[PDB]
C-alpha cells in the first residue's frame, strides 16, 4: 500500500534530518535513515535518532552507510520500497569548503549524481533535495525570490550546492517523468521544544546563533559584530534565520508536493524578515537571561548590509509558512544547550 | 630524468587528442594515451594513434581504461611517471547533453574529479584542462577576453565544462603548489594536414564544418543557413572556428606553461576573427571545387549574431597565436574527409 512505503532520509543522523525524522514521524511517514556518521555522533541509532524515537514513541529505520558507496545504494533500495527521497548528506561547513574543496565536491556532486543514478534505476523519481540560499550570491534586490539570478556564489559549497541544482534540473528537462523540489534557506537555528536534540557543536560553525549562545552561558567572553554602520535600521547586518522545526516541516510539504507530479519546483523558505545582529544578541539576552557583551570590530570586505529570502511562493504552492519567530528560535536554541551543553 | 618522464593525455585517441599526440611527439614529448573507446574507432591501438605513429615514426604507449574507474587510474599512476596530464576525456556533443545529462554530469564531473584525486595523490599537481569558451554563455561584448563573465550557458554540456573549471580554481586556491591550465576555445575543424587523421563522423555534431563538406561530397542537397538578418558584415551569424592543428600546438604550450610553477591561469585559444556561415560556405567552395547550395531559412530563437574569442592573452603569456586560417580549416578538412570518406 502507497501509505505503507518508506521515505529515505539521507543524512538523517544530522540537525536538519534528525528534525526532519521527528516530523516526518509525527506526520505518519515512516522513515528510513542513512548515515556515515561523518558530522553525527554515535546504542544501535545514532543518539540524535534515539532520542526523536524517545521523544515520539516510534520506530525509526537506519543504516549506516556512505552515499558514495554504490554498492550500498542498490543494496538499499532493494531492500526497502521508497515513495520519495529527502536528501540531507553532504559537507556543509561554509569555510571548511574554502580549505578542502575537492572533498566537498567529491561528496556533494559524485555522490547526488550516484543517488539520482540508482533513483532512476529503481523507479524512485521523486527527490526533495535541501538546498541553499547562498545559491543567488548577493542580493541584486531584496527580499530574494525564486526569479532572482542564481550562480554568483564564490565559496566552493555554496557552488556545488548549485551545481547540484542545475544538474537536478537539467534532469528534470530530460525526464518529465521525476519530480523534485529544490528548497532554498539559510541559517537554521533553534531545536525541537523538548530541547532533547538540536545541533551539536560544529567545527566551523556557519552562523553566530551558537556563539552567541555561548557568551550568554560564559564559555566566550563577547560577540564580535563586523560592522555596525550599515543601512540597515541599527547599522548592524540583517541576514536570515529559520527554526529548523519550521524548516523540517517544509521538508515535509515539499514531500507532500512530489504527490501532485509537479516536475521540478523551487521554493525558498524562511520567515520573511531579516534580523540584524544586534537583534540576535538581543533575543538572545532575553531567552538566557544573561548579559551578552559584543565588540564593534571593522566591516568585511564583501559583506552585504542585508539578505534574507522572500518565501511567499512556498505559501501559495506548498501551503507553508513559519510559524516560529526569533523569540522561539533562541529559547529554543538555549534549552538545548542548557540541557546538552557538549551536544549528545 | 625529468625529460624522459611522461604527458597523461585522457582521451587522446578522440579527436582533439589525437591530434594532441601527433604534436607532442613532435616537440620531443613522451605521451601515455588513456581512453576507453566510447568515441574512436579501434590493431592494438585506436587507429587514430596507429597513424599518428606512422605519420610521426615514434612510438605512442596506449591504455584502454575508463577515468571513472579507480582501480585503472591508481595502476595507472603507479606504472608510469607523469610530469603533467592534458585531460580530454569527456562527453561533448552539445545536442546530446540535453538528452541524457546525468552521463554528461557523471562522466565529466565525476571522472575530473577522481582523475584530480589521483593526480594529487601521486604528486602530479600539472593539469592541462580543455575546456571550453561556451562558459562564457552569450557574449555582453566581443570579442570575450578571460575577463568576461562566465557561468550563462544553458545546456548541460557547457554547465559541466564551467563546474570544473571551477572545481580546479578552488582546488588551486586552496593548494598553491598545483599548477592547471584552462584553456577556452569554440568549435575545432580542419584536420593535419596529411588527410591521414581528422575528426571521425559525429552522431550529433557540435558545428557546421561537417555538414558544409558533406553537401560539396554531394551526401546532402543543401546548407541551412538560420537568419540571413543579423547585425554582421553579411547579414548571417558569425562563430569562432580554430584549426584542431593550432588547437593542440596550443595544448603544448599550456604543457610548457606549468613549468613556470604558474598557479591556476586562464587562455582563450583562437583565431581572434569570426567567421559567418556565408564565409564559410564561399571558404569551401574554393577548397573543394564544389558549388555549396544553401537555403535561409527562419533565426532561431535565442541565437546571437556574432560570437568569438580575444586570443592576446595566450599570445602575451604562452607564446602562441593560430596560424591557420579558415582556408587552411577547409582545405584540410576537405582532404581528410576525401580520403577518408567514413572516417577511420
Ligand atoms: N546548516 C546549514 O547552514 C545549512 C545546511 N543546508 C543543507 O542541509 C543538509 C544537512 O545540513 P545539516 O543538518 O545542517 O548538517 P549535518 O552535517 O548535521 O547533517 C548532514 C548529515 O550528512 C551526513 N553525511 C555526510 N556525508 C555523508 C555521506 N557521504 N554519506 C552519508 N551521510 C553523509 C553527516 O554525517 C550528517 O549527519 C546539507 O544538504 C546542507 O547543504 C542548507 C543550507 C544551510
Ligand atoms: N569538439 C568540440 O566541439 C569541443 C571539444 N572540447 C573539449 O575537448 C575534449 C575532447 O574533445 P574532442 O576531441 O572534440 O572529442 P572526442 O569525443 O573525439 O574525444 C574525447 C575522447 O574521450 C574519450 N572518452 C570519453 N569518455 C571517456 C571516459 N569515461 N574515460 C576515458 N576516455 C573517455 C572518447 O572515447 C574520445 O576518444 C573534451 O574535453 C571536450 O569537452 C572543447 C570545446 C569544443
Ligand atoms: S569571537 O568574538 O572572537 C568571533 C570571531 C569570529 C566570528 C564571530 C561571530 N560573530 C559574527 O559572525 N558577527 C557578525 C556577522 C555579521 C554579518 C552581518 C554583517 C556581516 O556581522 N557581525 C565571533
Ligand atoms: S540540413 O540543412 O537540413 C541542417 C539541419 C540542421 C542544422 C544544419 C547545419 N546548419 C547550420 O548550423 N546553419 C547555421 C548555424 C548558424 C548560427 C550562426 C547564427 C546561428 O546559422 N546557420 C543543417
Redesign the interface.
Known amino acids: 500500500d502507497p501509505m505503507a512505503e518508506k521515505v529515505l532520509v539521507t543524512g538523517g543522523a544530522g540537525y536538519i534530518g534528525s528534525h526532519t525524522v521527528l516530523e516526518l514521524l509525527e506526520a505518519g511517514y515512516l522513515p528510513v535513515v542513512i548515515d556515515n556518521f561523518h558530522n553525527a555522533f554515535r546504542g544501535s541509532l545514532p543518539e540524535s535518532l534515539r532520542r526523536v524515537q524517545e521523544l515520539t514513541g516510534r520506530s525509526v529505520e537506519f543504516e549506516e552507510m556512505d552515499i558514495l558507496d554504490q554498492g550500498a545504494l542498490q543494496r538499499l533500495f532493494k531492500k526497502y520500497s521508497f515513495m520519495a527521497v529527502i536528501h540531507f548528506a553532504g559537507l556543509k561547513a561554509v569555510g571548511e569548503s574554502?580549505?578542502?574543496?575537492?572533498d566537498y565536491?567529491?561528496v556533494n556532486?559524485?555522490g547526488t549524481?550516484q543517488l539520482?543514478?540508482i533513483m532512476?534505476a529503481h523507479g524512485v523519481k521523486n527527490l526533495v533535495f535541501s538546498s541553499s540560499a547562498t545559491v543567488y550570491g548577493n542580493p541584486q534586490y531584496l527580499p530574494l525570490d525564486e526569479a532572482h539570478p542564481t550562480?554568483g556564489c564564490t565559496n566552493?559549497y555554496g557552488?556545488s550546492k548549485f551545481?547540484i541544482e542545475?544538474?537536478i534540473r537539467?534532469?528534470c528537462?530530460?525526464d518529465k517523468t521525476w519530480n523534485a523540489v529544490l528548497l532554498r534557506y539559510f541559517n537554521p537555528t533553534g531545536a525541537h521544544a523538548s530541547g532533547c536534540i538540536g545541533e551539536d557543536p560544529q567545527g566551523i560553525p556557519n552562523n553566530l546563533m551558537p556563539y552567541v549562545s555561548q557568551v550568554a552561558i560564559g564559555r566566550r567572553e563577547a560577540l564580535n559584530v563586523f560592522g555596525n554602520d550599515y543601512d540597515t535600521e541599527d547599522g548592524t547586518g540583517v541576514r536570515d534565520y529559520i527554526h529548523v522545526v519550521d524548516l523540517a516541516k517544509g521538508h515535509i510539504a515539499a514531500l507532500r508536493k512530489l504527490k501532485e507530479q509537479c516536475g521540478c519546483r523551487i521554493y525558498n523558505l524562511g520567515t520573511g524578515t531579516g534580523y540584524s545582529v544586534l537583534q540576535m544578541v538581543q533575543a538572545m539576552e532575553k531567552a538566557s537571561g544573561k548579559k551578552i557583551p559584543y565588540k564593534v570590530v571593522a566591516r568585511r570586505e564583501g559583506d552585504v548590509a542585508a539578505c534574507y529570502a522572500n518565501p511567499s511562493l512556498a505559501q501559495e504552492e506548498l501551503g507553508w509558512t513559519a510559524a516560529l519567530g526569533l523569540d522561539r528560535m533562541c529559547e529554543d536554541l538555549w534549552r538545548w544547550q542548557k540541557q546538552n551543553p557538549s551536544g549528545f
Open positions: 574554502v580549505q578542502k574543496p575537492l565536491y567529491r556532486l559524485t549524481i539520482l543514478e532512476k550562480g566552493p557552488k551545481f542545475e544538474m537539467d534532469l528537462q530530460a
